[PDB]
Amino acid sequence: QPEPDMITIFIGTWNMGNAPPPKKITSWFLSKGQGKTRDDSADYIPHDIYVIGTQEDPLSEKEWLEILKHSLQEITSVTFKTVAIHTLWNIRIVVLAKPEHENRISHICTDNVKTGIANTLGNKGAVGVSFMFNGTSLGFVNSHLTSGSEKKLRRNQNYMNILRFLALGDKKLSPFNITHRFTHLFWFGDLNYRVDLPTWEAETIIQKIKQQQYADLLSHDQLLTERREQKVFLHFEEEEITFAPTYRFERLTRDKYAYTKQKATGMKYNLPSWCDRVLWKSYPLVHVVCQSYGSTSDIMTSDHSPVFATFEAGVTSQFVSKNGPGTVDSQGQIEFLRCYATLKTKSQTKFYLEFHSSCLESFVKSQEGENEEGSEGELVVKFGETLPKLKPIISDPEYLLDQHILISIKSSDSDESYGEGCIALRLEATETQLPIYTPLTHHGELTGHFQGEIKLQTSQ
């Protein structure tokens, strides 16, 4: 039985509003309702992995797992295996996979982050799961961020705390946060960003939604505007939104948005908003295609509608050769030519690089670079032709061209990373000098750039 080179992944996010679900939730897992929906001809075809994120979840883990497994068995006639379940307060993540994948999945990690301080610590935060699927690392984050239209900057702060402190994936990747640890990272939840229009415009917004005219609402969505201004979710993708706002509904119908201020809301307005979202970030030049992004219309126990997204995702096989794993493949090498880092720092420490990759036996430290002053104020760290030649464990081009090199630039004085990025080895040519580039981030914000040339030697 051949190892897959693609899988499909279901992502669900639902703020359940502290209510039990209705008897039937199959529409969610079938990607049926509003938006980019899944073709009826696929309804019996199971996804490889289902990742369910809930917020305000009133159920026990056992109670929700039974509902989810029942739901999938009714759709697919497959009994899914539980990969992981993790709950923080009423924020939960469940990962289910087809039984045929049980031996393909390993290195399962879970963690949570509690956001806020004192008053604002005790119900918001995130849970996450990561694992390896054959040679491919997968990460999943379900976050419930701060509520309220006038708290976008708190949400952004909650995002940075979660990506700094959530401890998933390979702990040896010490300079790297979750935004660099995975081939594919999915981040979803009740992110709680709102449509920023005046309160007086509530009925006008409702009208627009009834006309399925979302453009003038999406142009005020705080998540899209904060992402455009590089305030949050830098280097993440989101499919185009073509479904109505998923919050805030009267329960037991979807005919009414409940937006007016009430004692129950802390006298806050809840204008119709796209609170419930799925974003992703995959390594450069890895296949990832969104095949659905939408909301259900028939699950009405909460003041939010469930959101679904599905993905095709490239995966690779657990490569063995006669050499690697457990030795080098002398035939293989990676050379960096004429490389330099451009950093936004005011610091004047010397810097060195670390190269990390599962195609290396262990990470590689460079010599210190040569600091120059750039034209428009910046620090340029030149490495020239000084960088160590990297010796991959396997030289077969079918393996090596699918790998990635994570780069950290670290201060010699503190050994702290000032920037992290990722280079694909999926090159147009081998034995040929080719341009490479990555932005560098630290704590998920832009700190610089790394560019130069690469020369990759494979066994072919």
Give the nearest distance from C-beta 224 to ligand K0G in angstroms.
6
Q: Which is nearer to ligand K0G, 44 or 437 (CB)?
A: 437
Euclidean distance between CA atoms 151 and 377, whole angstroms: 34
Backbone torsion region of residue 156, taken as left when φ is above 0, otherwise alpha when ψ lies between -120 and 50, otherwise beta: alpha
Q: Which is nearer to ligand K0G, 94 or 185 (CB)?
A: 185
Q: Which is nearer to ligand K0G, 314 or 369 (CB)?
A: 314
Give the nearest distance from C-beta 61 to ligand K0G in angstroms.
34
Q: Which is nearer to ligand K0G, 236 or 269 (CB)?
A: 236
Give the nearest distance from C-beta 237 to ligand K0G in angstroms.
5
Q: Which is nearer to ligand K0G, 38 or 227 (CB)?
A: 227
Sketch the per residue contact string, 49 through 88, with ligand K0G: x for CB under 6 A, - otherwise: ----------------------------------------
Q: Which is nearer to ligand K0G, 237 or 361 (CB)?
A: 237
Q: Which residue has the tokens 């090498």?
A: 333
The token pair that represents 388 in the structure block: 């160590």
Residue nearest to ligand K0G (CB): 228
Give the nearest distance from C-beta 139 to ligand K0G in angstroms.
16
> Is 227 an interacting residue with respect to ligand K0G (CB under 6 A)?
yes
Decide: helix, strand or coil at residue 312: strand
Residue in 427, 157, 426, 87 with CA at minimum distance from that of residue 282: 426
Q: Which is nearer to ligand K0G, 124 or 231 (CB)?
A: 231
User: What are the strands of the beta sheet with 351-356, ordered from one edge?
Assistant: 364-365, 351-356, 404-411, 417-424, 434-442, 445-457, 333-343, 379-384, 370-373
Instruction: Enumerate residues 338-357 that contact ligand K0G by CB under 6 A.
Output: none
Burial class (CB in 10 A: 0-12, 13-18, 19+), 384: middle
Q: Which is nearer to ligand K0G, 82 or 230 (CB)?
A: 230
Give the nearest distance from C-beta 445 to ligand K0G in angstroms.
14
Q: Which is nearer to ligand K0G, 224 or 423 (CB)?
A: 224
Euclidean distance between CA atoms 89 and 111, whole angstroms: 13
Give the nearest distance from C-beta 384 to ligand K0G in angstroms.
28
What one-letter code names the amino acid at 209?
Answer: I
C-beta atoms surrounding 143 within 10 Å: 30
Q: What is the DSSP letter of 429?
A: -
Euclidean distance between CA atoms 454 and 460, whole angstroms: 17
Torsions phi, psi for 448 (to 5 deg): 160, -165
Give the nearest distance from C-beta 230 to ligand K0G in angstroms.
8
Contact status, residue 340 vs residue 369, Cβ threshold 8 Å: yes
Q: Which is nearer to ligand K0G, 194 or 248 (CB)?
A: 194
Q: Could you tell me which residues come within 8 angstroms of residue 427 by beta carbon, excluding any fewer than 6 positions away? A: 401, 434, 454, 456
> Is 449 an interacting residue with respect to ligand K0G (CB under 6 A)?
no
The single residue among 11, 30, 224, 436 that binds ligand K0G, judged by CB under 6 A, is 224
Element (H, E) at 309: strand 307-314
Torsions phi, psi for 269 (to 5 deg): -75, 145
Q: Judged by CB under 6 A, which stretch of 22-30, 189-197, 220-228, 369-377 contacts ligand K0G?
A: 220-228
> Is 47 an interacting residue with respect to ligand K0G (CB under 6 A)?
no
How distant, in Å, are the alpha carbons of 140, 319, 378, 380, 384 from that of 409?
26, 29, 15, 12, 15
Give the nearest distance from C-beta 240 to ligand K0G in angstroms.
11
Give the nearest distance from C-beta 179 to ligand K0G in angstroms.
11
Give the nearest distance from C-beta 419 to ligand K0G in angstroms.
16
Binding residues for ligand K0G, how many (CB under 6 A)? 6
Q: Which is nearer to ligand K0G, 85 or 217 (CB)?
A: 217
Instruction: Enumerate residues 23-42 that contact ligand K0G by CB under 6 A.
Output: none
Contact status, residue 426 vs residue 399, Cβ threshold 8 Å: no
Sketch the per residue contact string, 228 through 267, with ligand K0G: x for CB under 6 A, - otherwise: x------xxx------------------------------
Task: Give me the residues that bind ligand K0G (CB under 6 A), please.
Answer: 224, 227-228, 235-237
